[PDB]
Design a protein around this ligand. Structure first.
Ligand SMILES: CC(=O)N[C@@H]1[C@@H](O)[C@H](O[C@@H]2O[C@H](CO)[C@@H](O[C@@H]3O[C@H](CO[C@H]4O[C@H](CO)[C@@H](O)[C@H](O)[C@@H]4O[C@@H]4O[C@H](CO)[C@@H](O)[C@H](O)[C@H]4NC(C)=O)[C@@H](O)[C@H](O[C@H]4O[C@H](CO)[C@@H](O)[C@H](O)[C@@H]4O[C@@H]4O[C@H](CO)[C@@H](O[C@@H]5O[C@H](CO)[C@H](O)[C@H](O)[C@H]5O)[C@H](O)[C@H]4NC(C)=O)[C@@H]3O)[C@H](O)[C@H]2NC(C)=O)[C@@H](CO)O[C@H]1O
Ligand SMILES: CC(=O)N[C@@H]1[C@@H](O)[C@H](O[C@@H]2O[C@H](CO)[C@@H](O[C@@H]3O[C@H](CO[C@H]4O[C@H](CO)[C@@H](O)[C@H](O)[C@@H]4O[C@@H]4O[C@H](CO)[C@@H](O)[C@H](O)[C@H]4NC(C)=O)[C@@H](O)[C@H](O[C@H]4O[C@H](CO)[C@@H](O)[C@H](O)[C@@H]4O[C@@H]4O[C@H](CO)[C@@H](O[C@@H]5O[C@H](CO)[C@H](O)[C@H](O)[C@H]5O)[C@H](O)[C@H]4NC(C)=O)[C@@H]3O)[C@H](O)[C@H]2NC(C)=O)[C@@H](CO)O[C@H]1O
Lengths: 152, 152
């Protein structure tokens, strides 16, 4: 049996389409796309820059016609890596979807981004753990999210 | 609990790093990167073009210093979708890694690409099944590969 990285979660709901992104190099940039002219998350982008200049990337959510009205940009820089996430799920335009999210690294907590309303979730804060990818479900918005994990 | 798409495999070996790529739209572009001046697979690229013009993409393998010496380009066009994979694992430069691969769609078999030596694997051909993503392991080369699946 070929080992796979241990999954935390996903947290959230069963709507939308499954998605998964675990690139071989470090995820160093995240985009939270907002809709509705407020801080309403509608899509997430995760990207990993390769030494050859290529960039692994995925965008999940934003599958409907919603206009993106704003973004938050998150950079995970040198000697920095993702260690945890937390956030909330709740109603946006009659959908129970991601409403806020925090990306925590070994250095800082990036966030919270969005609206801190709704049902909470948080990954397990494990000393020496690195989030090396994400998975979940999405459609118009982000229906669920979890993590792939690897120890330092 | 939050459903995830059913995994077939992975087939192969336990070396390298775990990787995973299940984009929300269809994978329409594959690159098989070769090394060594022959058809020796060293990396795989999977890409999915979104209607907004963004392109989800992952490249796995090619993590060492090897020069890319050739490629095979695979296009999965309109009314076409991936349905199965097959190939072999065997020794390349003292590593037991992917040596050949075929990408089968509802229209055509694309391949075999590489060298038809080594230990065989193939996914289950299921009427109405669609491969919606891939996962596996990789380092310098491709150590293992499997599929995410969704039915029509
Ligand atoms: C400009 C502006 O600001 N306008 C505002 C309006 O937007 C707003 O109205 C509200 O808008 C939201 C957002 O658009 C609406 O929510 C969406 O609704 C659509 C349509 O579905 C609803 O309407 C249908 C009738 O028109 C009805 O049949 C549906 O059942 C649904 O009805 C709703 O039902 C709920 C209760 O269940 C009620 O509370 C609602 O009132 C009622 N609405 C209506 C109008 O009647 C829906 O598609 C959207 O869902 C997608 O996204 C969410 C979030 O990510 C996911 O959870 C869903 O699963 C949907 O994603 C799709 O998921 C399926 C799987 O389930 C995927 O299918 C797979 O596809 C793959 C290929 O990928 C392959 O083919 C597989 O085989 C297949 O299974 C699919 O891909 C995926 N889609 C995408 C794009 O990825 C979302 O729920 C809301 O309904 C609407 N409300 C009202 C009252 O109108 C108003 C304020 O209300 O304000 C304006 O200003
Ligand atoms: C120009 C030209 O054509 N030159 C030709 C030569 O290339 C060729 O020589 C052969 O080359 C190949 C390819 O370069 C060599 O194979 C690679 O070797 C390296 C180095 O390791 C070997 O050498 C060490 C000493 O030098 C020794 O300590 C090692 O144990 C290993 O030794 C080999 O052992 C085998 C038996 O097991 C013997 O048969 C060999 O003879 C012997 N060789 C030597 C030289 O002694 C190795 O790194 C490469 O492995 C990576 O890639 C494979 C395939 O994908 C994976 O299966 C591996 O796991 C490796 O990937 C790494 O995997 C680890 C996890 O296991 C990842 O670590 C994680 O990383 C994350 C971050 O991503 C995080 O930090 C985690 O914490 C961490 O765990 C890691 O990321 C990942 N790496 C990458 C880049 O992704 C590969 O095996 C071959 O050894 C060599 N042979 C000889 C005899 O020299 C010659 C012909 O032979 O011809 C020339 O022309």
């Amino acid at each position: 049996a070929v080992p796979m990285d241990t999954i935390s979660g996903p947290w959230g709901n069963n709507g939308g389409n499954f998605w998964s992104f675990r690139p071989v190099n470090k995820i160093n940039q995240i985009v939270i796309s907002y809709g509705g002219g407020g801080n309403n998350p509608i899509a997430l982008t995760f990207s990993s820059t390769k030494a050859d200049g290529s960039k692994d990337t995925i965008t999940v959510g934003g599958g409907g016609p919603d206009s993106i009205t704003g973004t938050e940009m998150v950079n995970i820089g040198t000697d920095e890596y993702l260690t945890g996430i937390s956030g909330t799920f709740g109603i946006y335009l009659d959908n129970n979807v991601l409403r806020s999210i925090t990306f925590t690294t070994n250095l800082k907590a990036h966030g919270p981004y969005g609206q801190k309303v709704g049902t909470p979730f948080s990954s397990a804060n494990v000393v020496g753990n690195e989030i090396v990818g994400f998975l979940g479900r999405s459609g118009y918005y982000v229906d669920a999210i979890g993590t792939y994990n690897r120890h330092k």
